[PDB]
Write a protein that binds this ligand. Structure first.
Ligand SMILES: [K+]
Ligand SMILES: [K+]
Ligand SMILES: [K+]
Ligand SMILES: [K+]
Ligand SMILES: [K+]
Ligand SMILES: [K+]
Ligand SMILES: [K+]
Ligand SMILES: [Mg+2]
Ligand SMILES: [Mg+2]
Ligand SMILES: [Mg+2]
Ligand SMILES: [Mg+2]
Ligand SMILES: [Mg+2]
Ligand SMILES: [Mg+2]
Ligand SMILES: [Mg+2]
Ligand SMILES: [Mg+2]
Ligand SMILES: [Mg+2]
Ligand SMILES: [Mg+2]
Ligand SMILES: [Mg+2]
Ligand SMILES: [Mg+2]
Ligand SMILES: [Mg+2]
Ligand SMILES: [Mg+2]
Ligand SMILES: [Mg+2]
Ligand SMILES: [Mg+2]
Ligand SMILES: [Mg+2]
Ligand SMILES: [Mg+2]
Ligand SMILES: [Mg+2]
Ligand SMILES: [Mg+2]
Ligand SMILES: [Mg+2]
Ligand SMILES: [Mg+2]
Ligand SMILES: [Mg+2]
Ligand SMILES: [Mg+2]
Ligand SMILES: [Mg+2]
Ligand SMILES: [Mg+2]
Ligand SMILES: [Mg+2]
Ligand SMILES: [Mg+2]
Ligand SMILES: [Mg+2]
Ligand SMILES: [Mg+2]
Ligand SMILES: [Mg+2]
Ligand SMILES: [Mg+2]
Ligand SMILES: [Mg+2]
Ligand SMILES: [Mg+2]
Ligand SMILES: [Mg+2]
Ligand SMILES: [Mg+2]
Ligand SMILES: [Mg+2]
Ligand SMILES: [Mg+2]
Ligand SMILES: [Mg+2]
Ligand SMILES: [Mg+2]
Ligand SMILES: [Mg+2]
Ligand SMILES: [Mg+2]
Ligand SMILES: [Mg+2]
Ligand SMILES: [Mg+2]
Ligand SMILES: [Mg+2]
Ligand SMILES: [Mg+2]
Ligand SMILES: [Mg+2]
Ligand SMILES: [Mg+2]
Ligand SMILES: [Mg+2]
Ligand SMILES: [Mg+2]
Ligand SMILES: [Mg+2]
Ligand SMILES: [Mg+2]
Ligand SMILES: [Mg+2]
Ligand SMILES: [Mg+2]
Ligand SMILES: [Mg+2]
Ligand SMILES: [Mg+2]
Ligand SMILES: [Mg+2]
Ligand SMILES: [Mg+2]
Ligand SMILES: [Mg+2]
Ligand SMILES: [Mg+2]
Ligand SMILES: [Mg+2]
Ligand SMILES: [Mg+2]
Ligand SMILES: [Mg+2]
Ligand SMILES: [Mg+2]
Ligand SMILES: [Mg+2]
Ligand SMILES: [Mg+2]
Ligand SMILES: [Mg+2]
Ligand SMILES: [Mg+2]
Ligand SMILES: [Zn+2]
Lengths: 235, 150, 208, 138
RNA sequence: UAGCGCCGGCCAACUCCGUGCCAGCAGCCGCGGUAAUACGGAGGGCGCGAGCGUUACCCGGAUUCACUGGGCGUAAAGGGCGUGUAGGCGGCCUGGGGCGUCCCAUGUGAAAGACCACGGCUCAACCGUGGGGGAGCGUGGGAUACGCUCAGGCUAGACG
RNA sequence: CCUGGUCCACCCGUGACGCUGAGGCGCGAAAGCGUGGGGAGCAAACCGGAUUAGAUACCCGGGUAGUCCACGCCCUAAACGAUGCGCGCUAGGUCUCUGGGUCUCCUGGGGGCCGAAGCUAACGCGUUAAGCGCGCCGCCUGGGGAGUACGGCCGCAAGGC
């Protein structure tokens, strides 16, 4: 909540090409063939975005974090592994929201196989199944790791790159689910309800924004949590 | 609570090695006659499953109609594909004057007197979609002044 | 022509109990009480989902066969109502109810509308004093429909007006039983009629 | 050159609103300005103002839109859903006072050019004069 | 006195027998070559009814000559290309005229018909009375935003 | 050598002198016609060899008109972007031709590809519009009959409109 001057590395955008003209309002200028985000409008939108986040958090709402850019995977896997908001990390399966019932059936199979490997029924029905179901539970935990926490449809979603995760954005629009997103120059701002005009490539921007967001979430529900152990993931 | 009536039921066919294989498509309108309508198009290997699926899709796609004394507030003209729909309000005592598709759609919406005309393509699917978009493009004087507040 | 022939077959075909014989459509002998299916060899067979034209045509045929009016006069009355200002359906119903034979039936002078037609056609009915023998005569608000003084000694009128003791008449009608007369107070509203017919379906039928 | 400056302005407004622009510049003229007065008075635009481009005077029309909508296509509802020129060069349309159209059964406007100035449908009907049916907007 | 058409879909009304791409039906799609709701007959049904059908013709549906109200990349349809005559169309500002445009008053718009109201033949058809209308054109007066014209000015089009 | 078109920079000059365009007039690939010339290669017709059931073809060996030039005719076409001309408006990215400039790049004109909004029946089009508009010309109104018949105009004829 004090990220005014500590925003080191967020103003960096993508190149001159691969941009979206609809983002021109959130751009300050172009330095050395690279779009640089407007520093003022960044916090201008951050006010309203974080205010919506606090309102939805203190009401007890669930937010789905979505990240697949391979630069925010290890960060989302723990910033959402804090206060119990679910997440999707490896890839966004088509129909996680519109076909939410079938994916919940997949989650049922996940916890069923978890109950099988907890019961003494592991050894019966010989080793063929002990390998098949082992690999099946492996991949189910690989994909539905954070998604298993959703019992109903989420009240909002959080996206790291709305261009790379455009399918989740589209499904959220279809179901009238608010779309919080960390938008860059390559993204369409109209599809994002609450926009965060920052960098989606640099690890520091993602760590800063997501850490402060989860800190605001836990601050809305009381019991301020220690700083997130995602700094060591700078590497 | 919800009234349901099918527009048309057709049997389409694909070609497979050995012969043609059929698939049934059905249009279904659902309405409470209070100002809410819904249009759905379901496809299933059998007819009853297609009718039920079209009913589900019709309940999923709803349109709020701003009725004013059982008629429409202002004349509309909608081009869906090559099909054109022309809606025009009428005084009470007239009745719903329309083709089968728009008559069913507007009657299930709660309309009692209106003057319509289908133009261009008479295709029941495109005419149904044109009538749905027409009802979706309806505005009231309240909505008009709401837009022009400034 | 007046369709003259079997009547309760229409009670069956129309699917709704009609009253074309007066009595015996109230007694368990209407053949609609015991045979509600349409007539013919294929009456008991499973009916197919009728078309919209089927629904509108059957509704209009119900409304027409209720009064026993030919298609010519029926279409003429409908066009006449559509020319007038006001709701086409309610004005049409008020016109049909204004027919002299239907007024005779409503005032209890005859048990059925066809018996009322025979009573009018044979000069047993007077309007404001003058004898009128036209079932298609239109009654105006304020006209006194009376029984012919020379006919008040007939057996049928004695029976009919002997059964009308204690019975009530429509809100738009008054009845003097001792003098064997009545008055047409006003045109009846749609709420006043208990007809099992949707008039908008008939309007849509003639909209084609 | 422009064969119909008024229709050119109306088309500029149409194409600008269809992409949700902020404002649009139209080559200035007293007729266009008297039309934009009616536009701003009726509420189809936030307003207009005279500006200067490199050497020539123009009119900046500040467009007006509705609130951002939900679901797919969050683009807001257009305040000017439809704007069409009627009395074009080569086929000019003149109407008497009893021949003035009621646009969308009252919800729209019809801009008339009459001997008493540029008015709307209701304004000209109240004044009691007809003239050239410039355009219709609703 | 009750008759006439229809009963595969459009289109309201289904069975039996005969026939076997024969005999035939048919407004359009089409039906008949062994078990035809389509032919022929019967029973039954549907629609009208002193009428019911057929044919012809007109308008309609037909937005299918598109003023309202259509089109031309591949469905019918951009001329092989240019120069350019008549014609059609005409950037910004001021003024005069008032031809187009608009407004007021007035005359004309016979009667019958059409519309509305009341009334006369027992109703109706038919008829009478009264009322209301109305585009267009003539005249007098007025308005000048736009189109027009004349006079002047400007440089964003055009040319140099 | 003679000559047309066109683009950019300066903001210099005229002061609406503009757009389109029924007729008219001119241009108009190839083939074809006339007169004269030329004629290496190619090559309709044709002369043969093969192939084939036959081969008036494809394949092979020859070969005339023609292709070429001058002058004069002919007016056709898948004469094609199967998209008339002009102007204004409406996201961009990339490739390229050609100017100008503070020469990473910007700006202007032209040729391509991908694509916003939008359009379209779809394919697809998308600042080179098939989008949004305006002006003007041409043309369409089911298929066959038929681009035929008659008539007219044009042409030496073939034939064309
Ligand atoms: K459209
Ligand atoms: K025979
Ligand atoms: K038969
Ligand atoms: K007209
Ligand atoms: K020679
Ligand atoms: K052509
Ligand atoms: K250069
Ligand atoms: Mg609404
Ligand atoms: Mg179309
Ligand atoms: Mg059509
Ligand atoms: Mg009426
Ligand atoms: Mg009427
Ligand atoms: Mg006039
Ligand atoms: Mg009206
Ligand atoms: Mg009012
Ligand atoms: Mg049927
Ligand atoms: Mg027959
Ligand atoms: Mg015929
Ligand atoms: Mg046999
Ligand atoms: Mg048989
Ligand atoms: Mg038969
Ligand atoms: Mg019979
Ligand atoms: Mg006849
Ligand atoms: Mg016809
Ligand atoms: Mg027509
Ligand atoms: Mg029409
Ligand atoms: Mg025709
Ligand atoms: Mg037209
Ligand atoms: Mg067309
Ligand atoms: Mg073509
Ligand atoms: Mg061309
Ligand atoms: Mg001229
Ligand atoms: Mg000229
Ligand atoms: Mg001018
Ligand atoms: Mg002129
Ligand atoms: Mg003046
Ligand atoms: Mg004048
Ligand atoms: Mg007269
Ligand atoms: Mg008269
Ligand atoms: Mg009378
Ligand atoms: Mg008058
Ligand atoms: Mg005058
Ligand atoms: Mg003056
Ligand atoms: Mg001048
Ligand atoms: Mg120059
Ligand atoms: Mg100068
Ligand atoms: Mg000068
Ligand atoms: Mg030219
Ligand atoms: Mg020419
Ligand atoms: Mg040539
Ligand atoms: Mg040649
Ligand atoms: Mg030669
Ligand atoms: Mg020679
Ligand atoms: Mg050779
Ligand atoms: Mg050879
Ligand atoms: Mg040979
Ligand atoms: Mg052979
Ligand atoms: Mg041989
Ligand atoms: Mg020769
Ligand atoms: Mg080509
Ligand atoms: Mg071309
Ligand atoms: Mg072009
Ligand atoms: Mg370019
Ligand atoms: Mg493309
Ligand atoms: Mg699109
Ligand atoms: Mg596509
Ligand atoms: Mg263009
Ligand atoms: Mg023909
Ligand atoms: Mg031909
Ligand atoms: Mg032809
Ligand atoms: Mg030819
Ligand atoms: Mg000839
Ligand atoms: Mg000759
Ligand atoms: Mg020859
Ligand atoms: Mg020829
Ligand atoms: Zn009965």
């Amino acid at each position: 909540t004090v990220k005014e001057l500590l925003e080191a590395g967020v103003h960096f955008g993508h190149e001159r090409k691969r941009w979206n003209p609809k983002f021109a309002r959130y751009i300050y200028a172009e330095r050395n063939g690279i779009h640089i985000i407007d520093l003022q409008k960044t916090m201008e939108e951050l006010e309203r975005t974080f205010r919506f986040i606090e309102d939805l958090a203190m009401r007890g709402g669930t937010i789905l974090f979505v990240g697949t850019k391979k630069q925010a995977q290890d960060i989302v896997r723990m910033e959402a592994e804090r206060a119990g908001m679910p997440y999707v990390n490896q890839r966004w399966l088509g129909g996680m929201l519109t076909n939410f019932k079938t994916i919940s059936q997949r989650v049922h199979r996940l916890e069923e196989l978890e109950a099988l490997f907890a019961s003494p029924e592991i050894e019966e029905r010989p080793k063929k199944e002990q390998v098949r179901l082992k690999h099946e539970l492996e991949r189910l935990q690989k994909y539905l790791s954070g998604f298993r926490l959703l019992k109903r449809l989420p009240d909002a979603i959080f996206v790291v790159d709305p261009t790379k995760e455009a399918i989740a954005v589209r499904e959220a629009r279809k179901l009238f689910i608010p779309v919080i997103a960390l938008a860059d120059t390559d993204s369409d701002p109209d599809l994002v309800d609450y926009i965060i005009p920052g960098n989606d490539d640099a690890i520091r921007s993602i760590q800063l924004i997501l850490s402060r967001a989860v800190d605001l979430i836990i601050q809305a529900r009381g019991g301020v949590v220690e700083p997130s152990p995602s700094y060591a993931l700078v590497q | 609570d919800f009234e349901e009536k099918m527009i048309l039921i057709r049997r389409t066919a694909r070609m497979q090695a050995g012969g043609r294989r059929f698939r049934f498509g059905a249009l279904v309108v659902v309405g409470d006659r209070q100002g809410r309508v819904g249009l759905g198009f379901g496809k299933a290997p059998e007819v009853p499953l297609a009718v039920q699926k079209a009913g589900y899709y019709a309940r999923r796609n709803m349109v709020e109609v701003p009725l004013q004394n059982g008629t429409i507030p202002h004349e509309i003209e909608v081009e869906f594909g090559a099909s054109k729909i022309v809606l025009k309000p009428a005084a009470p005592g007239t009745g719903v004057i329309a083709g089968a598709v728009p008559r069913a759609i507007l009657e299930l919406a709660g309309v009692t007197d209106i003057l319509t005309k289908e133009l261009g393509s008479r295709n029941p699917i495109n005419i149904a979609y044109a009538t749905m978009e027409a009802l979706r493009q309806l505005r009231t004087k309240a909505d008009v002044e709401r837009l022009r507040k400034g | 022509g007046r369709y003259i022939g079997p009547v309760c077959r229409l009670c069956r075909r129309e699917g709704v109990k009609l009253y074309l014989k007066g009595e015996r459509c109230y007694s368990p002998k209407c053949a609609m009480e015991r045979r509600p299916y349409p007539p013919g060899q294929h009456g008991q067979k499973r009916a197919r989902r009728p078309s919209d034209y089927a629904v509108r045509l059957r509704e209009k045929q119900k409304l027409r066969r209720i009064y026993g009016i030919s298609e010519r006069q029926f279409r003429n009355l409908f066009e006449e109502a559509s020319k007038k200002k006001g709701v086409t359906g309610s004005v049409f119903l008020g016109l049909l109810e204004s027919r002299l034979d239907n007024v005779v039936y409503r005032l209890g002078f005859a048990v059925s509308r066809r018996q009322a037609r025979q009573l009018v056609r044979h000069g047993h009915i007077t309007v404001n004093g003058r004898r009128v023998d036209l079932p298609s005569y239109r009654v105006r608000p304020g006209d006194e429909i009376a029984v012919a003084e020379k006919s008040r000694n007939l057996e049928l009128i004695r029976q009919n007006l002997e059964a009308m003791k204690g019975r009530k008449v429509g809100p738009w009608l008054s009845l003097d039983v001792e003098g064997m007369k009545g008055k047409f107070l006003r045109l009846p509203d749609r709420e006043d009629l208990a007809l099992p017919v949707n008039e908008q379906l008939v309007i849509e039928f003639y909209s084609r | 050159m422009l064969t119909d400056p008024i229709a050119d302005m109306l088309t500029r407004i149409r194409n600008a609103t269809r992409v949700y622009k902020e404002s649009t510049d139209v080559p200035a003229s007293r007729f266009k300005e008297e039309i934009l007065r009616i536009l701003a008075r009726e509420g189809f635009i936030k307003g207009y103002e005279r500006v200067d481009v490199d050497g020539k005077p123009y009119l900046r029309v500040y467009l007006k839109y509705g609130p951002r909508r939900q679901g797919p296509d969050p683009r807001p509802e257009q305040v000017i859903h439809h704007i069409r020129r009627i009395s074009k060069p080569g086929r000019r349309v003149y109407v008497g006072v009893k021949e003035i159209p009621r646009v969308r059964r009252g919800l729209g406007i019809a801009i008339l050019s009459t001997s008493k100035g540029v008015l709307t449908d209701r304004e000209a009907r109240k004044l009691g004069v007809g003239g050239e049916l410039i355009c219709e907007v609703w």
